């Protein structure tokens, strides 16, 4: 295999591939289908692909429609097999349309709609011979039914057709003659009683972190320790530089918080239009970043610089200008680096491998301003620092009473929260930090907490709540926090509410003691 050795077993790996295949499909249907075929989870025939789409388990129905509408020879065959899996016999045209329109969402392009509705009409007529004199009749009536659905049910259409209007509107449609009055009336009445129920695509953008970015585009980037070049889709937004393998990916490959970095033009012997991201104040020091490993676990980057090649000098200039404008500049970052380096223990590596100490991966989440970063550095540096809001994440490893805690502190601002799920994989303990003086946002904190702990990737995590800011007047006590966060209901999980004051340190060691005592 050649992987780091973590969760490895049949059910684990197979379910992961299944989930990976679906995620890929929803970003790019051709690529998801190819992944599943390569991973022996799907057979390559049009009929097999059709069955996969027809079941559509965890598949975006708009994406299904996009794929089925394509002009490709393979896609045309998939479409025909897809319509063949629908049984329209002994159903009227509205009932058949209800069924078909549950299975996918119609694409926007006229030629794609036409291909799909021709395939539907042909199938309907084969299933119900003699009802319509031609496929054309069936196709046109299908759109008369769709237009009726709009006219009756969209408030923007003022004049609602009567049954008699619908009947007469369709005169001559049956290859020059009229369809049965009672058939048209039945169709009208069905639509009038119940609009078409349409599946609604929610969740495609898994995140919504990258919406309306400062800049995006393809670049080539050089690796950290292993100096290999990779083509990556970059998105610059909210003081972070993200990169992805494919534009269809819904999770980043890498995240680079733009904290006190600079940009320089460089010459490269093989790649054109190159620049580097680097830290001018700490030459040779690792740039804070994270990247995703094969199993989805986020890990720290190893870069001292990021060398990047743009496809033209124009795009190079654009990217440099944009990145420079998006750098978060603040003494805070230099303060952290300097203090960390002072108490940086070289021996720690030779002792960590020898004690062979086991450790504990921690994800620390909570609303913005809760106290997360203050807690992190109180633990890491033994001192209370003056923080600024965290645009991406901070990550530190803290040794406490023979346990090494690898602590991921993720920014809690609104815009960042859809990205929290990115950091779940591998989490052994959740620290959820709450501002106990903030009664205005306690219900919001409750909502966020339960979304986290109900996630499939977080089911096994023990839960430490830091009921923070106990120093403040009228701050909610641990028993109130227990109630307000709805923890009392949860009797099947291991959780604890630890009162804390991050700025004095009160309660922090107690919380770490609880984690060690309860981690199994
Ligand atoms: N009074 C009081 N203030 C605190 C306490 N802990 C943290 N703070 C302050 O609350 C503010 C926000 O704390 P941070 O540690 O930056 O909060 P955060 O959770 O990291 O916020 P994000 O980076 O946006 O996710 C800072 O001014 C801290 O000094 C505390 O225990 N008592
Ligand atoms: O793909 P191969 O040739 O194995 O080499 C990888 C890629 O260059 C990675 O880039 P990407 O993450 O874009 O796939 C890079 O991670 P970075 O993203 O941190 O550059 C790794 O850096 P190191 O882990 O530092 O060696 C490097 O080992
Ligand atoms: Mg913070």
Curated annotation (Swiss-Prot):
One of its GO terms (biological process) is positive regulation of cell adhesion. It is found in: Cytoplasm, Cytosol; Cell membrane; Cell junction, Adherens junction; Cell junction, Tight junction. Keywords: Cell junction, Cell membrane, Coiled coil, Cytoplasm, Guanine-nucleotide releasing factor, Lipid-binding, Membrane, Tight junction. A 1,2-diacyl-sn-glycero-3-phospho-(1D-myo-inositol-3,4,5-trisphosphate) binds at residues 221-228, 232, 243, 253, 302. Disulfide bonds: none annotated. Residues 25-154 form the SEC7 domain. It comes from the Eukaryota. It is a peripheral membrane protein. Residues 212-328 form the PH domain. GO terms for cellular component: adherens junction; bicellular tight junction; cytoplasm; cytosol; nucleoplasm; plasma membrane; ruffle. Residues 339-347 are annotated as: C-terminal autoinhibitory region. GO terms for molecular function: guanyl-nucleotide exchange factor activity; phosphatidylinositol-3,4,5-trisphosphate binding. Promotes guanine-nucleotide exchange on ARF1. Promotes the activation of ARF factors through replacement of GDP with GTP. Plays a role in the epithelial polarization. Binds via its PH domain to the inositol head group of phosphatidylinositol 3,4,5-trisphosphate. Interacts with TAMALIN. Interacts with FRMD4A. Interacts with FRMD4B. This is Cytohesin-3. It comes from Mus musculus. The chain holds residues 63 to 399 of 399 of the full protein.
């Amino acid at each position: 295999m050649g992987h780091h050795h973590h969760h490895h077993g049949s059910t684990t790996q197979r379910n992961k591939q299944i989930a990976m295949g679906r995620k890929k499909f929803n970003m790019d249907p051709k690529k998801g289908i190819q992944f599943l075929i390569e991973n022996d989870l799907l057979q390559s025939s049009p009929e097999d692909v059709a069955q996969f789409l027809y079941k559509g388990e965890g598949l975006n129905k708009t994406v299904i429609g996009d794929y089925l509408g394509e002009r490709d020879d393979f896609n045309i065959k998939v479409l025909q097999a897809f319509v063949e899996l629908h049984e329209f016999a002994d159903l009227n045209l509205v009932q058949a349309l209800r069924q078909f329109l549950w299975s996918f969402r119609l694409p926007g392009e006229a030629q794609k709609i036409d291909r799909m509705m021709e395939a539907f009409a042909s199938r309907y007529c084969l299933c119900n011979p003699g009802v319509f004199q031609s496929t054309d009749t069936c196709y046109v009536l299908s759109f008369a039914i769709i237009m009726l659905n709009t006219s009756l049910h969209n408030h923007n259409v003022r004049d609602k057709p009567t049954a008699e209007r619908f009947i007469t509107m369709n005169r001559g449609i049956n290859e020059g003659g009229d369809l049965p009055e009672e058939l048209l009336r039945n169709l009208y009445e069905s639509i009038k009683n119940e609009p078409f129920k349409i599946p609604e695509d929610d969740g495609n953008d898994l995140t919504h972190t990258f919406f309306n970015p400062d800049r995006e585009g393809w670049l080539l980037k050089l690796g950290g320790r292993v100096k290999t070049w990779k083509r990556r889709w970059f998105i610059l937004t909210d003081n972070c530089l993200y990169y992805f393998e494919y534009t269809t990916d819904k999770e980043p490959r890498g995240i680079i918080p733009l904290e006190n970095l600079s940009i320089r033009e460089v010459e490269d012997p093989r790649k054109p239009n190159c620049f580097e991201l680097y830290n001018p104040s700490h030459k040779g020091q690792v740039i804070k970043a994270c990247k995703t490993e094969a199993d989805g676990r986020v890990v720290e980057g190893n870069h001292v610089v990021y060398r990047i090649s743009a496809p033209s000098p124009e795009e190079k200039e654009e990217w440099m200008k944009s990145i420079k404008a998006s750098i978060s500049r603040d003494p805070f970052y230099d303060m952290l680096a300097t203090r960390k380096r002072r108490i940086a223990n070289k021996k720690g590596k030779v002792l960590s491998k020898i004690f062979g100490n086991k450790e504990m991966r921690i994800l620390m989440l909570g609303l913005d301003a809760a106290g997360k970063t203050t807690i992190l550095y109180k633990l890491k540096l033994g001192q209370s620092v003056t923080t600024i809001p965290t645009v991406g994440f901070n990550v530190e490893t803290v040794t406490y009473k023979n346990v090494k805690f690898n602590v991921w502190d993720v920014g809690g601002l609104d815009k960042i929260r859809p990205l929290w799920r990115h950091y779940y994989t591998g989490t052994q303990g959740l620290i959820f930090v709450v501002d106990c003086a903030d009664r205005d946002r306690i219900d919001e904190a409750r909502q966020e907490l339960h979304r986290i702990i109900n996630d499939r990737e977080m089911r096994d995590a023990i839960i430490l709540i830091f009921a923070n800011k106990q120093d403040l007047p009228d701050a909610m006590k641990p028993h109130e926090i227990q109630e307000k966060l709805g923890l009392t209901r949860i009797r099947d999980r291991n959780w604890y509410v630890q009162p804390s004051c991050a700025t004095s340190g009160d309660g922090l060691y107690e919380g770490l003691t609880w984690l060690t005592s309860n981690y199994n």
